[PDB]
Amino acid sequence: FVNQHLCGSHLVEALYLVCGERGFFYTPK
Amino acid sequence: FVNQHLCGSHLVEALYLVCGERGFFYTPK
Amino acid sequence: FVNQHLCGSHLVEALYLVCGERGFFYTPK
Amino acid sequence: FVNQHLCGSHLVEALYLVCGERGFFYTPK
Amino acid sequence: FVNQHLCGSHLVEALYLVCGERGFFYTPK
Amino acid sequence: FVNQHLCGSHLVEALYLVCGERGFFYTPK
Amino acid sequence: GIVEQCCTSICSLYQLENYCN
Amino acid sequence: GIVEQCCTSICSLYQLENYCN
Amino acid sequence: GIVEQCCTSICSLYQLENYCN
Amino acid sequence: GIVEQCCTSICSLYQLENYCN
Amino acid sequence: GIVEQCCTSICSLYQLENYCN
Amino acid sequence: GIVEQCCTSICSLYQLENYCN
Ligand SMILES: *C(=O)CCCCCCCCCCCCC
Ligand SMILES: *C(=O)CCCCCCCCCCCCC
Ligand SMILES: *C(=O)CCCCCCCCCCCCC
Ligand SMILES: [Cl-]
Numbered sequence: 001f002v003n004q005h006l007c008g009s010h011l012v013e014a015l016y017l018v019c020g021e022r023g024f025f026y027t028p029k
Numbered sequence: 030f031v032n033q034h035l036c037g038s039h040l041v042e043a044l045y046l047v048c049g050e051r052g053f054f055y056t057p058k
Numbered sequence: 059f060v061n062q063h064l065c066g067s068h069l070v071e072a073l074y075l076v077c078g079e080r081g082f083f084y085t086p087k
Numbered sequence: 088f089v090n091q092h093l094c095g096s097h098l099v100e101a102l103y104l105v106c107g108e109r110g111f112f113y114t115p116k
Numbered sequence: 117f118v119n120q121h122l123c124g125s126h127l128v129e130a131l132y133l134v135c136g137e138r139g140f141f142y143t144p145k
Numbered sequence: 146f147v148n149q150h151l152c153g154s155h156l157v158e159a160l161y162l163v164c165g166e167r168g169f170f171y172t173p174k
Numbered sequence: 175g176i177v178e179q180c181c182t183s184i185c186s187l188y189q190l191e192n193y194c195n
Numbered sequence: 196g197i198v199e200q201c202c203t204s205i206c207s208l209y210q211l212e213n214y215c216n
Numbered sequence: 217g218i219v220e221q222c223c224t225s226i227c228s229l230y231q232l233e234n235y236c237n
Numbered sequence: 238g239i240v241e242q243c244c245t246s247i248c249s250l251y252q253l254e255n256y257c258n
Numbered sequence: 259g260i261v262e263q264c265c266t267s268i269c270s271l272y273q274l275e276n277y278c279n
Numbered sequence: 280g281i282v283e284q285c286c287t288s289i290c291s292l293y294q295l296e297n298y299c300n
């Protein structure tokens with residue numbers, strides 16, 4: 001599902017910004 | 030350190046693509 | 059100054075996410 | 088509307104490039 | 117087709133990462 | 146050289162938008 | 175506004191330029 | 196997970212923050 | 217071309233590599 | 238301006254909010 | 259090349275067009 | 280960490296894979 005792939009790319013950029021020094025795991029599944 | 034912040038933005042984009050369904054972990058320094 | 063140009067590209071991405079429906083203003087130096 | 092959110096992210100990057108030294112307001116609503 | 121425009125933007129970023137020192141042509145048509 | 150790698154990521158995004166249906170060529174140094 | 179114009183149809187750089195200062 | 200929550204509906208920065216460490 | 221192949225289905229990095237120089 | 242403030246140090250999300258409309 | 263030209267100074271949109279096909 | 284490894288030199292795709300889960 002390409003639109004899902006594209007959405008995930010923006011998700012990870014947003015987590016990078018929100019989480020800051022905290023870091024994050026990205027766990028799609 | 031802004032340059033580290035800009036590098037990390039590109040690193041998470043790359044991890045998203047490299048890691049696929051595994052996802053990834055990002056922790057800044 | 060290219061490094062300022064690269065910083066600003068990330069700043070507008072961040073403003074888009076932070077500011078939501080308010081939108082934002084970007085003026086370079 | 089997530090696809091609208093994703094489109095806006097690319098819009099702001101394109102305005103950053105086109106407007107250059109002029110700057111811009113991003114006014115979604 | 118805006119979704120096509122958005123997809124292409126992510127395509128070119130992925131080619132940049134995969135191709136590395138090799139470079140690439142982006143030939144949509 | 147990481148800073149060159151970050152610059153090039155922004156250059157291909159800009160070429161994608163500037164060049165339209167012509168596409169573009171990217172070759173790193 | 176820019177979202178109704180340019181998320182319903184592709185805006186060229188020349189159309190986007192209308193939104194600059 | 197984050198894709199089902201935030202690709203079906205817009206997540207604000209406050210909702211995204213739930214996924215941070 | 218790359219848009220018909222990789223905007224209709226997800227292309228992995230290995231499939232994208234076909235488009236490199 | 239935002240460049241002088243947020244390209245010389247990392248701005249927090251609340252600092253960035255000063256450039257919202 | 260584009261890196262030497264446009265990573266050492268900001269290239270205008272018309273300078274970038276030299277790297278279109 | 281990834282910042283110390285991959286912001287001081289360019290990491291290959293296989294080096295980046297060390298930060299997958
Ligand atoms: C925490 O805020 C900083 C810790 C890591 C800093 C990395 C410094 C690396 C070299 C960058 C030099 C840039 C310009 C002289
Ligand atoms: C206009 O073109 C430039 C005005 C602002 C320039 C900012 C300089 C800030 C410090 C960056 C140093 C980078 C490497 C030594
Ligand atoms: C190959 O790996 C490098 C060849 C081109 C290198 C460009 C160096 C340009 C000036 C950047 C200086 C950055 C900080 C002092
Ligand atoms: Cl950058």
Ligand SMILES: [Cl-]
Nearest residue numbers: 006093122123
């Ligand atoms: Cl997208």
Ligand SMILES: [Zn+2]
Nearest residue numbers: 006010093122
């Ligand atoms: Zn996108």
Ligand SMILES: [Zn+2]
Nearest residue numbers: 035064151155
């Ligand atoms: Zn960057």
